[PDB]
Design a protein around this ligand. Structure first.
Ligand SMILES: OC[C@H]1O[C@H](O[C@H]2[C@H](O)[C@@H](O)[C@@H](O)O[C@@H]2CO)[C@H](O)[C@@H](O)[C@@H]1O
Ligand SMILES: OC[C@H]1O[C@H](O[C@H]2[C@H](O)[C@@H](O)[C@@H](O)O[C@@H]2CO)[C@H](O)[C@@H](O)[C@@H]1O
Lengths: 456, 456
């Protein structure tokens, strides 16, 4: 028996391996920590083919998609264990009423600044250009951060109204995306103007921003707790504070709960459970990871209470409360690819802000569906159809499906409909002109449950 | 403005028209009560084309479907009014969290018997053949009831294991249908044998059975409270009692809550509300209807208490307690059509019991969908596909749909996935042989969430 763990390369993987060593000492079970690039993207393929890790660490947003596809083992910790972690952290790793991972720590981005360059950091994003111009006369810049991952730019986009999926009545609506509204637009435009006026560069990534900050070349960066360890070993005298406002509004970072899921195909699930409950999620376990790269606000009450007085963590939590806990619904992956695309294109000039976000809006609503009711004589049959795709793309196979569904329907209630008959088929509302085939159901203004017929 | 009301022709429509005349007297608003044949089948088509009644009366089972398709207005009685009816009746008219009709009364089938022909009615279905021989010697028969509508045969079909859709933790599973299991077969076979052995006739419908019982030609019938009025005016001395057992188990009638829905296109929604709240659902209103044809155990607490003492209503409730409240899910009507034809065909000998029920099982089960996740490169996309239809029927348009949904996806993530076919498209699990195109997802053992790829 053995445990293979996947964790991101920016986290305390060496510290986690120390917890692994201790576990091995006590049980004979070897633990191997790995940090492959794009592990959150690779996990589905490998997990499905029996090649995945036994345990995967990532922020909770990815785990809904994994769970929906059966990739993660349901977690059944006793109430004694559940009590040891904050309740809102368990909420982050619940999918369809089941717990699907162990929560580890709460992460939010903060503003990190160099006290020697910048004794008083700006309250507002709008101050940055003037500050940069002043700093440029001394061979420095105001602000550098990773522009290749939308995680980092989201706080600014959401500040004046950008949102991912509309939440209400317990539910996220994947048809209602907030990536093209006025707020998101104003946020991204502000970022792109920073680039145009040479206050930032479109190609700046994680390592470039981190090096600039840790070498005293830029006055500010935006990052999470994991980054503090490299800043400590550097010269820099730094603080961690609330993100700047934009148009008077707090920056609203998406908050992640670093979580550990168990592969549903692991041959060693019981050992994974014992490793995480009795070794990792202890004061001693989290200390070993946190000492390598800080976790932020850990989900473990006893240790959280112990670190809470650290001002860097207090600032993490201040930024967290101003932000939003990420959804964990499956469509988050598609949201993130869309926003990533939109930020990168707009920043580089390949697309205008309007065009980038309009496309992202389109795409984040991946395969939204509309339920329609087909009326065939007196028989009604519900169909789930793509909302945004033109009707002509799927009408033929849809008529063939209905044919098979209704084949044993008694003919009295069928109204004489014969789907085997030849035809140029189209949808129509009863007593109305047919819907044009080159439109989607959305284009046609069709709501869930709408009654439709077919006509030839 | 006027109110046009539809109610079934077995109900107290003259009594209801009397409540109508009182409303007209007080308000000047004319009320027209109509009882068209098959009104529950007609309602969707006419309602969608602006020709429906303002108010429709039917058992609650139909109203989920009407509501899903926007044909019913949302009902907003204040709490004072809601407290006047039993909570369980409101539950019956709740669809997706909204009240969609006013509940009027609880209806269950009972056994009705001629006390002069049969002082002690049988406790078991199994007794009926021998009882019928005795009664034939006297020119009479034992039992006659409507065989043309599955409502009346369902209690027997359900006794030893028949069910419509399996229910558990809050939700009905339309993939899990109980129409062709051993219990349902057992029940329906018993019925078909009564007909083979000449204890009943397959052609017997509602009027024939009613006429025979009310003339004193048959010792028993099976019917609901609406029927008692015609027996009262007849010379028959009758009792209403618990249905007989089958294989030692209670007959389980499907219980309906007769309910009044308001048409979403009614130009007179407020008038219908005042009529239903302040005129029908009062002791005086319900009494007027009940005096024409009995309603059963009414939803209005004040009047239900007044009539509870009546042993005919107590027997109704006893039968209701042994049975089950009907689902109001939209799939109910399709279920009913399938079972209707299945019983008629077995009873006539046109098909065997096994083949009739197999077809109704397949017909009620063919509406279901399965959620799958398609992996293209490292990108996952959820699709909602028909569960019981062969994959080949919809694969081509499905691939075309997916191509359109993915066309603005960034390419690094699609990992060189080739969208142009090397011949026939097929689904496959990651790293596994393809699924057979002539099978459904159900045949292939695919559950909700399954990770599939596309291969050619
Ligand atoms: O950039 C989109 C990306 O954002 C988040 O990923 C974070 C992660 O939560 C942190 O733990 C940290 O490692 O940085 C990542 C961003 O580079 C989402 O969790 C992730 O799903 C999403 O793709
Ligand atoms: O036979 C199937 C039929 O059953 C029920 O209809 C009942 C109705 O509930 C009663 O009020 C009474 O009038 O008799 C009907 C049977 O003829 C369901 O309510 C109906 O939806 C279904 O088609």
């Amino acid at each position: 028996g053995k445990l293979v763990i996947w964790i991101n390369g920016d986290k305390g993987y060496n510290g986690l391996a120390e917890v692994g060593k201790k576990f091995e000492k006590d049980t004979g079970i070897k633990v191997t920590v790995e940090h492959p690039d794009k592990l959150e993207e690779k996990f589905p393929q490998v997990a499905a083919t029996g090649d995945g890790p036994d345990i995967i660490f990532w922020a909770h947003d990815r785990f809904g998609g994994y769970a929906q596809s059966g990739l993660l083992a349901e977690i059944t910790p006793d109430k004694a264990f559940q009590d040891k972690l904050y309740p809102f952290t368990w909420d982050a790793v619940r999918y369809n009423g089941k717990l699907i991972a162990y929560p580890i720590a709460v992460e939010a981005l903060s503003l990190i600044y160099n006290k020697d360059l910048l004794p008083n950091p700006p309250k507002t994003w709008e101050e940055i250009p003037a500050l940069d111009k002043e700093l440029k006369a001394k061979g420095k810049s105001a602000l550098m951060f990773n522009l290749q991952e939308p995680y980092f730019t989201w706080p600014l986009i959401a500040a004046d109204g950008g949102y991912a999926f509309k939440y209400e009545n317990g539910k996220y609506d994947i048809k209602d995306v907030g990536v093209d509204n006025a707020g998101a637009k104003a946020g991204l435009t502000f970022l792109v103007d920073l680039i145009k006026n040479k206050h930032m560069n479109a190609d700046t990534d994680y390592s470039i921003a981190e090096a600039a900050f840790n070498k005293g070349e830029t006055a500010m960066t935006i990052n999470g707790p994991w980054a503090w360890s490299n800043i400590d070993t550097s010269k820099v005298n730094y603080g961690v504070t609330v993100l700047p406002t934009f148009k008077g509004q707090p920056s609203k970072p998406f908050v992640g709960v670093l979580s550990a899921g168990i592969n549903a195909a692991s041959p060693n699930k019981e050992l994974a459970k014992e490793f995480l409950e009795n070794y990792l999620l202890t004061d001693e376990g989290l200390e070993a990871v946190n000492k390598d790269k800080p976790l932020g606000a850990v989900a473990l009450k006893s240790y959280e209470e112990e670190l809470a007085k650290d001002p860097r963590i207090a600032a993490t939590m201040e930024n967290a409360q101003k932000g939003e806990i990420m959804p964990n619904i499956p469509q988050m992956s598609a949201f993130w690819y869309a926003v990533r695309t939109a930020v990168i294109n707009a920043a580089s000039g390949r697309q205008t802000v309007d065009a980038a976000l309009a496309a992202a809006q389109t795409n984040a609503a991946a395969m939204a569906t509309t339920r329609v009711t087909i009326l065939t004589g007196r028989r009604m049959t519900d169909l789930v159809l793509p909302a945004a795709v033109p009707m002509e793309t799927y009408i033929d196979d849809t008529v063939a499906v209905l044919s098979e569904v209704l084949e044993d329907t008694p003919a009295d209630v069928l109204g004489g409909f014969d789907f085997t008959a030849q035809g140029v088929w189209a949808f129509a509302r009863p007593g109305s002109p047919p819907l044009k085939l080159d439109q989607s159901l959305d284009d046609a203004g069709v709501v869930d449950g709408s009654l439709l017929t077919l006509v030839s």
